[PDB]
Structure 1
Amino acid sequence: SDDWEIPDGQITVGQRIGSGSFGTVYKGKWHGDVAVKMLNVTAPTPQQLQAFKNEVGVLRKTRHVNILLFMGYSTKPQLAIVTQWCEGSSLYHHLHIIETKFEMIKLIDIARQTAQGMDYLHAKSIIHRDLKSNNIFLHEDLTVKIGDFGLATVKSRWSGSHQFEQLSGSILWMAPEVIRMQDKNPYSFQSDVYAFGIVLYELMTGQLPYSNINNRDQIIFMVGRGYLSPDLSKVRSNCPKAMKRLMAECLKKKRDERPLFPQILASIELLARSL
């Protein structure tokens, strides 16, 4: 395939939804409700543009029940992204805003589907780079849908032919090696596994990590230095021991000790049976 570009006059941009780490989302129309994210890199370079096109080509061939569909892009008004529009609230809204009260069965199931989708993404060698409860939607309250995966070329504006990842996004899910931004490519499968570990912390504690640290830059420095770690004491009492042990494995400071998603997905399913 090739030209995944959407012309002008085909996208009915609607109410402004909100801005995130690398774009501002509007609810547009395009053969049905869609999510139009106006990228921050509105003026892209021809080298950055072609890299963005290549990555769009890899994201379009993704199809999984736990993955938000990637429908292409547009560049008429400004560079934007067109993705499947999701009903209901995100996982972040359920856990930390709406304070929905799930049962441990449903919580572990949400962790399973999330690992399911993540396992599919890594199966196609796709690094999410921004895994968090904000990018996990519960379509119809039942199924899980991961969004805002990939898109490394639209994150970290380029200079001409370089893309030095200027660390952006929410810091709570960033792995230490990502925080430091020191060795070549910090974003790896294990960096996603770490973020997944922080999502597990969300599910098993109902809190965001570092509930006693209200300094953004203090968390950045201490987490990057290996001084700060999510306090696992905050895990609910009804949480399975095996789940807690898996969470601790995903949050290992040294990324080489974190498991991959095939093993993670197996551990979650095993402890879901013995329940």
Structure 2
Amino acid sequence: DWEIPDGQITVGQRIGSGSFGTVYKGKWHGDVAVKMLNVPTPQQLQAFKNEVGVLRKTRHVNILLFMGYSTKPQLAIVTQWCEGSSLYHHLHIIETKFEMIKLIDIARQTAQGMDYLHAKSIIHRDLKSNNIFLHEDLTVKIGDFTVKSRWSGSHQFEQLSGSILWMAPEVIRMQDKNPYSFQSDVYAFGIVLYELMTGQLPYSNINNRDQIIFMVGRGYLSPDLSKVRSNCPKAMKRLMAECLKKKRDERPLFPQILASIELLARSLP
């Protein structure tokens, strides 16, 4: 049982809305985060039931800690509160210059988290620097949390509405009814590795969203790995390429990926 009875959760400042509901800072045996829907439709109830149903299966330090939910008086999910920013914020907005050892550490922790989810047969489906939080700018927390991010104009009448830089080629073309897989999450992680080592989003030379969608889809685009830092290990550049392979089955799984990163971690001056 994880149901939090009514009147315990003290809701505070609103911080955002996200894809579903509204997210506030809270108090419940200390600071918390509260994702709340205010009304409930059968599709809203199914989203809630599924979101709790995934989170309740995760006990890992690099996954965002679920703490409990509220059925009455309204639908709500309570997670830990974290002081810090998303990886996206650090790298692209305020443009933090992390040391190479810390960039590899962030990569290692993200791999640890993704490996755990895949071991539990959980496909994230929307991994990206936005959904990697740095708790005290130190510890990676993977979740599902955007702010005029590159393509500011609304994609209301477009097919692909969400974030396309992290989507694998098979996920863009959508030839299968469900093209999401463990290898689709590996490609997304591949782009996160690119962000860490370049300090930049991929396809910077191109300014047409639709052209990136098309070209990544038909395999004419993959990120320019020469843009990495000079003290980036060759072993990382090789791993990055394996993660971003256009063909699905040629991409490795996180057990091998995490192994490769922990190896090159030990040997760097």
Query: Which TM-score band applies after superposition, normalised by the shorter structure?
Result: 0.7 to 0.9
Moved more, 203-212 or 85-94: 85-94
8 A contact 1:16–1:25 mirrored in 2: yes
| TM-aligned CA distance change 1:161 to 1:197, over 3 Å | closer
Secondary structure at the residue paired with 2:67? strand
Secondary structure at the residue paired with 1:78? coil
Secondary structure at the residue paired with 2:229? coil
Q: CA deviation at 1:217?
A: 2.4
- Distance in 2 separating the partners of 1:158 and 1:97: 14
Q: CA deviation at 1:21?
A: 4.0
| TM-aligned CA distance change 1:40 to 1:107, over 3 Å | farther
Q: CA deviation at 1:74?
A: 3.4
Moved more, 211-220 or 153-162: 153-162
Q: CA deviation at 1:123?
A: 0.8
Secondary structure at the residue paired with 2:249? helix
Secondary structure at the residue paired with 1:83? strand
Secondary structure at the residue paired with 1:214? coil
| TM-aligned CA distance change 1:139 to 1:120, over 3 Å | same
8 A contact 2:48–2:75 mirrored in 1: no
| TM-aligned CA distance change 1:155 to 1:69, over 3 Å | farther
Moved more, 49-58 or 176-185: 49-58
- Distance in 2 separating the partners of 1:132 and 1:15: 26
Number of aligned residue pairs:
268
Deviations 1:24-76 (A, max 9, x none): 422122222222234699xx654773574255234213111111112233355
| TM-aligned CA distance change 1:158 to 1:218, over 3 Å | closer
| TM-aligned CA distance change 1:37 to 1:167, over 3 Å | farther
- Give the 5 Å matches for 1:133-144: 133-144=129-140
8 A contact 1:52–1:154 mirrored in 2: no
Aligned CA RMSD, in angstroms, stands at 5.4
Q: CA deviation at 1:126?
A: 0.7
Q: Does 1:247 align with 2:250?
A: no
8 A contact 2:69–2:78 mirrored in 1: yes
8 A contact 1:178–1:186 mirrored in 2: yes
| TM-aligned CA distance change 1:182 to 1:8, over 3 Å | farther
8 A contact 1:176–1:224 mirrored in 2: yes
What TM-score, normalized to structure 2? Answer: 0.85
Q: CA deviation at 1:22?
A: 4.3
Deviations 1:203-230 (A, max 9, x none): 0000011112222222222222222222
| TM-aligned CA distance change 1:112 to 1:9, over 3 Å | same
- Distance in 1 separating the partners of 2:157 and 2:112: 30
Structure 1: where are the runs of 5+ without partners? none
- Distance in 2 separating the partners of 1:70 and 1:232: 36
- Distance in 2 separating the partners of 1:237 and 1:144: 25
| TM-aligned CA distance change 1:13 to 1:170, over 3 Å | farther
What TM-score, normalized to structure 1? Answer: 0.83
- Distance in 2 separating the partners of 1:218 and 1:162: 15
Partner of 1:206: 199
Moved more, 112-121 or 91-100: 91-100
Deviations 1:61-108 (A, max 9, x none): 311111111223335575443222111122111111222221111111
Partner of 2:28: 30
- Give the 5 Å matches for 1:168-247: 168-247=161-240
8 A contact 1:167–1:181 mirrored in 2: no
Moved more, 110-119 or 177-186: 177-186
Taking every aligned residue pair, what percent have the same amino acid on both sides?
100
- Distance in 2 separating the partners of 1:98 and 1:195: 22
